[PDB]
Structures are given as C-alpha cells and as structure tokens.
C-alpha cells in the first residue's frame, strides 16, 4: 500500500491560490455584517467577520483594530486585536483560539489559550500561548502540548513550558521537556531537540535494547556527532550485563576526493567471562578495529582498502556487528593501490590475514604484491596480452619458509567469427621464477625438497569454439541451441621444489569447465591435456526476453592432470576418461516465481561434488518467500579440504534446506520468518522469527534469532552450541519520514542472510 | 536442418554504439566494451554529431557476498556471490530502457589458505563481470523490440 496517503487523510489538503512572497505589503480585505468606529483609529467589526490578506484567511465573530501614533516615521503601527471566536487559517497552520492579537508589518501573531494544527503535514497540539514571530519563521509556544498522531488513540505526546519551532533552521527545541506515552510521563529533561529536517542531525539520542544468551541484558545508547556535510562520527556506549561493562563503539564515516570510507573502533576494558575462560593473564580487554575505503581519482587512479583486525580470535563469536559474525573464520587485511587506464593497468597491493583459531594461524601474507597488465587488441588478425607479477610472500610463523616470486605471462590470441559460430585460438606462455628462503627448518617435519633458486617454464595451447542454432516454437516463443567445445594442452613440469602460497582447488561451474586453471594463483599448475564439451539450450519468448535456460557440461581427459605433488585423497584411482560433469539451469515462468539449479559431479569421488537449488516467489518490491537447498558430499570435503575430514563437524559435509517467509498478515504488522535446517545431523542450524508494529508516528520491532555458534568439545563425540537472541528496537520517524517498513531488512540479519535469487 | 543465426542478430540500428559510464576504467566497463568488441560492434565517442546513434549507459554495479551454508560448528562452509548490474539504453527520440542483470556463483572457504581463497575469489569476480557483460548483450533485442508505436 501507500500508507503515506493513509496518514494524509487526517491532514488537511488546503486549496486556495498560492501567493509567492509575504502577505505583509498586500492590502487587507474586510467583509462583515457589522462595523462601527474610526476605521484608521478604532475599528470594530462584528457578525461573521471575514478578513483576508494574501494567504492570511481570518474568520471571527468580533474583530477590533486599535492603533498607536506611528507619527514622524513612518508606517502605521497597524495593530489588529481579536476578542472572541478567533479562527485563523493560512497555507501552513490552522489556529483556533478565544483571544488574539496581530501586527501585520512584522507579521507577528499571538493567540492566547488556543489549539493548533499543521496544514499539508501532520502535527497538532494545544498551547496556552501560540505565537508566530520573526516574519512567521519562529513558532513560539508557551505552555504547549504537541503530538503528531491526530485521532483515534492518544498514544504519545510531548509537553513543555517553552517550545520553539524554527522553520529555516528546521528544528523543534523544547525547554523543560516531558515525554508521555498517552497520559503517563516517563522522562524529564531541562532541554531537548526534535529535528524536523534531514541532513546534519545531532538529534537528541535514540537507544536500543537487546537480550542475548552470551552477553545477557544489552543496552545501547549511541551518540551521534555530525562534523561536516561529508564526514561524521558515531559513538556508542553498549552496556553488557554478563560481560559486566560498557563497550564503546566508535564509528566514523568520511567522504573526500580521494574516496569514501568508514572507520569503526569497538572497545571493552574489562570482560569477566573472558577472564574466567582465559585466566592466563590479567589482561582482559577486547577490541575491534575496522577500516574500509573506496576511491577512484581522475578515473585512472584506484585506491581501495579493506582492513579488519581484532584482539582475540573469539571476538566475532561472542560480539555481533555489521562488520563480522560467528561464521567468519578469519580477518582480512588488504591494502590496494592501482593505476588503471585502458590498455594498461598496474595495481600494487599488500595482503595480510588473521585466522580465528587458538593454535593453527599459519597463514601467509604478501608484502608487497605487484600486478601489471598491458593489452594490444589489434595486431592484424591477432590480439596480444601481457601479464606480469612480482610477489614477496612471508609468514607470521618464522618456521614457515619465505619466498620471492617473479612471474611473466604473455598471451597471444586469435579470434575468428563468421555468423553461425566462432573459433578462437589462444597460445599462452607461463614463465615463473622463485627465490625462496628459510627452507632448512621446514625441510624437516614432512617430506619436502624445496630449493632456494627455482624456475618453471610452461607453454599452453588452447582452442575454443562455439556455434548457434535456432528452432522456432509455439505462440512466438523461440528456442536456441549453443554447442561449445574447447581443447587445452599444457606439458608436465615437476613442481615438488615449489612451495604453496596462493594455490587451492576450485569449484567447477558450467563456465568454470572452460577455465584453463586447475588451482588458484600461480604456484601449482596442472599438466593440461583435455577436451571440454558442453551444451547450452536457451528458451526465449515473443518479447525477446530470456525466460528459460539450461546447460550441461563434460570434461574429457586424455592424461591425468599432474603437478608433481598431487597429494589429493581420492576415493578411487581413475586417471583418464570423462571425470568432470556439470549442469546448471534457470527458470522464470512468469512475472513472479522462478527456479535456479547448479550441479557438479565427479567420478573420482563416486558421488556428486556440489548440488544447489533455489526457488523463490518474489512479487516485485517486498512481501516474498524463498526456499533453497545446498549439498556437499563428504568425499568432496575429504579430497578438497584435508585434516578437516578428520574432525567430526566437517566430516558429514553439507546438506541443508533454507526457508524464508515474509507475507504480511495485517496491513500494519510485518511478519518475518526464516528456517535453515540440516538434514545430515537432523538439527536446526538456524531460525529467525521477527515482528514489527508500524503505526504512523512510531515503530517498535522485536526480533528472535536462534543460531549455531561454536562446537562443543568432549562429551560423547561432541555437539553444536546453540545461541538465542532477542532484540527490542524502537524507531520514531514519521517526521522527516521515508521510513517504517523493514520489508526484507529483518530477513538479512542472521548468520545465513536472505539473498535475492529472483 | 533448421535456420541458423539466432538470439536476434545484433540490431543493425545499434551496429555502431556509444558507451557511457561513470567509471570507464572499471572492470565492468572494460568487460562490457570488450564483449561489444567481440560481437563486432563499433564504439564511437560522444564528440561527433550523434543523431541516429543510440548509447549504452552503465548505472552502477554491486557485488553481494553472504553465507550460503555452514558446517556443524557454525563456521562458514561456502560463500555465495551475487553481482547486481544496472544499465540503461538511450535511443535519441525513443526515451530510455532499463536493463537489470544479476550473476550468481558460489565457492567453498578455507581459512588456513585464505590467501589462496582470496586470489581465487578475485578470479571469480573477474569471470562474474565477464558473464555479466554477456548477460547485458543478450538482453539487447528486448530493447530493440520494445520500440513499438503507441
Ligand atoms: C446588509 C449588507 C451587508 C453589509 C455590508 C456589505 C457591504 C460591505 O461594505 C463594507 C465596507 O467596509 C469596507 C472596508 O474596506 C477595507 C479596505 O479599505 C480600507 C483601507 O484600504
Ligand atoms: C544513508 C544515511 C541515512 C540518511 C540520513 C543522513 C543523510 C545521508 O547522507 C549523509 C552521509 O552522506 C554524506 C553526504 O555527502 C557529502 C555531500 O557533500 C560532499 C560535497 O563536498
């Protein structure tokens, strides 16, 4: 619906001609039945007196005009008095009162013991003295009671001895303020500020309450400080009961020509629970430093920054924020600066990490890492590319070996196209040099033979090609068939003397089947000798809109992909043949509803690698439902992730069903539900139930979230730890408005958020 | 033995096109103009007459990385990435035509070798851009057939 229109029902519409300017110099029209005395001195109108002046529409029973000398210079003191039944109306606010007064030169109007109601926008009240001074800019209220929600139920109201509504500065100042939820007062303050406008807040202070199982009773009262119309800060005292103390959260948004950015800094001086769990030292302070930055200077310069650092590896597990959650397994600390033009681009960056584990944080870090690309799209029929990289890798642990890698990779391409299809021949070269150090210490432990000066040269030959066919269907629908084939060959090179720094197994999507890489980075390159064949059938309608599509792929191997250190734990020992299979699909049906699917299968695992399927009923903007499902076989986990399969929590793999419900029961309350459930251990991993009360001038929301957090050791093998979380949040709004709802906001908040899958 | 050449031959009206964007050096922009170069489309700047020649304006892109699934300990199993791209076709005298596309992928996470998983991630992003560009090109005939008399 358009609730705004519903809230504009009680609010007057105001007709009348809109006069541009001020009704001060404009003449005064007086129409009544009765009118005695001296007109420019002591005038007395009676009997349905109607006085108009530009936008000033006044109607009363008796009106008196009493003047002063105003001699010499210059104007007349035009002083208009009003005895009884004064009904004033204009383009801004309707006033009703017994006794009134008005000076039309300075446009200063006074009304004693009257009631007021805004026009065009919500806002009413009753005051002992209602005044419009300062050329109808400053709205002074002596002994005033103000409220926004007009009829039905006296739900809330603010009373004050001295209230001031400024229109230019756009603000409602209140002296001796008292807030009421009807007839029962709660808070009293010597002074308060209620903003009417938008930019540059410094609004009083709006708090929020929570109730978690780990922190207990949580109470946040975040301070807001706007410095300048580009950057500002946001402090946040966050009282925690079980933790026993106030956690200070320092936000800082900024926006400069060098780019935008955000700086968060949470801090907790003393933690009792963390002290009891870890009494190795008296130091029990827990903090979080976050810094993000995104900048594009002169379209050619690119300055990006993603820095995230915590104090203890168990921070995000306990404390929850918009910067991390219990699902995070490590912290990312990357800085990136690059010059990207058009045919050339050189980006240098430093990558560091922070693994969230008590004793297994042997993660590497690039320091620095230089990337360079140089293109040439026209060398006759050919188009050439040049890639270069220099990366110095180090490790936090001084036991692990260090390295200095210099990679060079030229790529010559030859595109051919005619009409029914196309064929592209790509010949690439992969040269690489390694200067490794601190090897003697790691030469022990396990079977390793890493040398200081290593080199590697691997050529690559690839031939891609795809065709396009058409088959006409019924009632305007048009089907098309896209067959695709790509051969790849790379000779074998023994890489047992080369360490692993940025190489891991990938996932084989339908498009990923046509990828000339087996691992990530440039450390482990497989001996390619394969042919990839895939089919892509698509279904369009009469409006040339893709409604349906389906793809199925198959990779055939002539010889096994060897690197020289293939320590992959496969189920069987199949080396050749069609090992890798894939299949994606997408359905749209109508304007609403839809379907999505993706399946990856491998014969060496004797079971499907991955399997995801997501269906969704989406309207257009809000109120929607989603149902998803994901599966990852134990063999996949065993082969791709070693040592993880040894544990009991990563052994069974993945097999979960996701639920997301969001359909409004009443045209006021917003119902929100979610349910992620595992089928392997038949236990509910996550679930969320939230509700909201959107009246018109205020809104309270209650959220419930039960989720899996950590793993419980010992016991009878071990089980999953469960954590519940209640949340009471209150937002006023309705003033500057453009809020309320929540629609889907409440959905994205769990450890497994709701994504828009159409 | 059915007729070949499908998905509607890239409109001869838009055989030569102008590309507009806030960040022409961005990955999305370069992937788009490269995908245009692939389909045999001429790219000319907006410094000429520009009367019959339409244009393609890139509104903005947005990549969303959320947790798709988790293990039994609460830690992330695999992340699902969603690249949302907004665009608009501007034909001189035929108003505008909005084009919204989305790319969906996913990949497993490994803290131990985060760095590797970072590189991989970047690679994924690149591909997700390219495919996005493809998804932008295939939705052009809809804009072509949108030009109706009323
Ligand atoms: C029984 C007939 C209704 C009785 C009055 C109707 C005629 C209205 O005449 C009122 C005359 O007063 C007009 C005052 O003019 C105000 C503006 O001029 C004063 C300064 O410019
Ligand atoms: C989206 C925040 C909630 C909305 C209320 C605050 C208003 C939104 O903008 C505040 C932050 O944006 C910074 C303003 O942009 C800088 C403008 O001046 C820069 C030109 O030098």
Automatic annotation (TrEMBL), chain A:
Localization (cell): Cell outer membrane
GO biological process: Gram-negative-bacterium-type cell outer membrane assembly; lipopolysaccharide transport
Domain LptD C-terminal positions: 285-669
Segments forming domain Organic solvent tolerance-like N-terminal: 29-170
Gene Ontology CC: one annotated term: cell outer membrane
Transmembrane segments: none
UniProt key word Membrane: yes
Cysteines engaged in disulfide bonds, as pairs: 7-696, 149-697
Keywords: Cell outer membrane, Membrane, Signal
Top-level taxonomic group: Bacteria
Gene3D superfamilies per UniProt: Lipopolysaccharide (LPS) transport protein A like domain (2.60.450.10)
Pfam families for this protein: LptD, LptD_N
Subunit structure: Component of the lipopolysaccharide transport and assembly complex. Interacts with LptE and LptA.
Similarity annotation: Belongs to the LptD family.
Purpose of the protein: Together with LptE, is involved in the assembly of lipopolysaccharide (LPS) at the surface of the outer membrane.
Entry protein name: LPS-assembly protein LptD
Organism: Klebsiella pneumoniae
Organism classification: Bacteria, Pseudomonadati, Pseudomonadota, Gammaproteobacteria, Enterobacterales
From TrEMBL, chain B:
The entry's keywords: Cell outer membrane, Lipoprotein, Membrane, Palmitate, Signal
BP term (GO), one: Gram-negative-bacterium-type cell outer membrane assembly
Membrane topology of this protein: Lipid-anchor
GO cellular component term of the entry, any: transporter complex
Keyword Signal: yes
Major place of residence: membrane
Record has rRNA-binding as a keyword: no
Source domain of life: Bacteria
Localization of this protein: Cell outer membrane
Sample GO molecular function, one term: lipopolysaccharide binding
Purpose of the protein: Together with LptD, is involved in the assembly of lipopolysaccharide (LPS) at the surface of the outer membrane. Required for the proper assembly of LptD. Binds LPS and may serve as the LPS recognition site at the outer membrane.
Family: Belongs to the LptE lipoprotein family.
Subunit-structure text: Component of the lipopolysaccharide transport and assembly complex. Interacts with LptD.
Name of this chain's protein: LPS-assembly lipoprotein LptE
Organism of origin: Klebsiella variicola
Gene: lptE
Coverage span on the entire protein: 20 to 169 of 196
């Amino acid at each position: 619906a358009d609730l705004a229109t519903q809230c504009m029902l009680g609010v007057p519409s105001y007709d009348r001609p809109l006069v541009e300017g001020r009704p001060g110099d404009l003449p005064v029209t007086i129409n009544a039945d009765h009118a005695k005395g001296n007109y420019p001195d002591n005038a007395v109108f009676t009997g349905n007196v109607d006085i108009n002046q530009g936008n000033s529409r006044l109607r009363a029973d008796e009106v008196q005009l009493h003047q002063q000398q105003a001699a010499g210079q210059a104007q007349p003191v035009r002083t208009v008095d009003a005895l009884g039944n004064v009904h004033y109306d204009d383009n801004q606010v309707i006033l009703k009162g017994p006794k009134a007064w008005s000076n039309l030169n300075t446009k200063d109007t006074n009304v004693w013991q009257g009631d007021y109601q805004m026009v065009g926008r919500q806002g009413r009240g009753t005051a002992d003295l209602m005044k419009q001074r300062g050329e109808n800019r400053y709205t002074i209220l002596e002994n005033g009671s103000f409220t926004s929600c007009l009829p039905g139920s006296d739900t809330w109201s603010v009373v004050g001895s001295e209230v001031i509504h400024d229109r230019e500065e756009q603000v409602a100042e209140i002296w001796n303020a008292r807030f009421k939820l009807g007839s029962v007062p709660i808070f009293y303050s010597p002074y308060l500020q209620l903003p009417v406008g938008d930019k540059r807040r410094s609004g009083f202070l709006i708090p929020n309450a929570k109730y978690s199982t780990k922190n207990g009773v949580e109470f946040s009262l975040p301070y807001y400080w706007n410095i300048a119309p580009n950057f500002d800060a946001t402090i946040t005292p966050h009282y925690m009961n079980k933790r026993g103390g106030v956690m200070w959260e320092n936000e800082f948004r900024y926006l400069t020509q060098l780019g935008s950015g955000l700086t968060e800094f949470d801090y907790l001086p003393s933690d009792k629970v963390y002290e009891d769990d870890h009494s190795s030292d008296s130091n029990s302070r827990r903090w979080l430093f976050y810094w993000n930055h995104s900048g594009v200077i002169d379209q050619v310069w690119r300055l990006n920054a993603d820095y995230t650092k915590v104090s203890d590896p168990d921070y995000f597990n306990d404390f929850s924020s918009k910067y991390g959650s219990s699902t995070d397994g490590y912290a990312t600390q990357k800085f990136s600066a690059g010059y990207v033009n058009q045919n050339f681009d050189a980006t240098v960056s430093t990558k560091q990490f922070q693994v969230f584990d008590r004793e297994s944080s042997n993660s590497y870090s690039a320091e620095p890492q230089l990337d360079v690309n140089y293109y040439q799209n026209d060398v006759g029929p050919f188009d050439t590319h040049l890639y270069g990289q220099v990366a110095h890798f180090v490790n936090s642990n001084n036991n692990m070996p260090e390295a200095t890698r210099v990679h060079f990779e030229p790529t010559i391409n030859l595109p051919l196209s005619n009409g029914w299809g196309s064929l592209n021949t790509e010949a690439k070269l992969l040269a690489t040099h390694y200067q490794q150090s601190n090897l003697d210490k790691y030469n022990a432990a396990n079977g390793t033979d890493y040398k200081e000066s290593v080199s590697r040269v691997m050529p690559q030959f690839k031939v891609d090609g795809k065709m396009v066919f058409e088959r006409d269907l019924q009632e305007g629908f048009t089907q098309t068939l896209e067959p695709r084939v790509q051969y790849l060959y790379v000779p074998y090179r023994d890489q047992s003397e080369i360490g692993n720094y940025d190489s891991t197994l990938l996932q084989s999507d339908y498009t990923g089947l046509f990828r000339d890489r087996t691992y990530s980075g440039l450390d482990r390159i497989a001996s390619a000798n394969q042919v990839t064949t895939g089919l892509t059938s698509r279904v369009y309608d009469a409006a040339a809109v893709e409604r349906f599509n389906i793809s199925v792929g198959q990779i055939y191997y002539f010889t096994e992909s060897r690197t020289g250190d293939d320590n992959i734990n496969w189920e069987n020992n199949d080396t050749t043949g069609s090992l890798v299979w894939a299949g994606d699909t997408y359905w749209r049906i109508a304007d609403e509803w839809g379907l999505r699917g993706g399946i990856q299968y491998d014969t060496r695992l004797d079971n499907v690698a991955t399997g995801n399927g997501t269906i969704e009923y989406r309207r257009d903007e809000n109120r929607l439902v989603q149902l998803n499902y994901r599966y990852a076989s134990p063999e996949y986990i065993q082969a791709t992730l070693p040592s993880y399969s040894t544990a009991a929590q990563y052994k069974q793999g993945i097999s979960q069903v996701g639920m997301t419900a969001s359909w409004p029961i009443v045209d006021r309350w917003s119902v929100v539900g979610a349910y992620y459930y595992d089928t392997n251990t038949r236990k509910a991993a996550n679930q969320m139930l939230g509700v909201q009360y959107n009246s018109c001038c205020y809104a309270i929301r209650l959220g419930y979230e039960r989720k899996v957090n950590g793993w419980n050791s010992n016991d009878n093998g071990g089980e999953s730890k469960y954590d519940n979380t209640f949340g009471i949040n209150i937002e006023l709004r309705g003033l500057s408005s453009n809020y309320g709802l929540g629609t889907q906001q409440m959905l994205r908040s769990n450890i497994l958020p709701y994504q828009s899958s159409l | 033995g059915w007729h070949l050449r499908s998905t509607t031959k890239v409109p001869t009206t838009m055989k030569t096109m102008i590309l507009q964007s806030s960040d022409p050096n961005g990955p999305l922009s370069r992937a788009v103009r490269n995908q245009l170069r692939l389909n045999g489309v001429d790219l000319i700047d907006a410094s000429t007459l520009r009367k019959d020649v339409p244009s393609l304006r890139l509104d903005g892109s947005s990549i969303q990385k959320d947790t798709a699934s988790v293990f039994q300990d609460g830690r992330t199993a695999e992340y699902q990435m969603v690249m949302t791209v907004h665009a608009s076709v501007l034909i001189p005298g035929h108003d505008i035509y909005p084009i919204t596309t989305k790319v969906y992928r996913s990949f497993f996470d490994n803290p131990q070798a985060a760095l590797a998983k970072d590189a991989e991630q970047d690679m994924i992003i690149q591909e997700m851009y390219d495919k996005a560009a493809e998804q932008l090109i295939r939705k052009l005939p809809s804009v072509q057939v949108a030009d109706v008399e009323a």
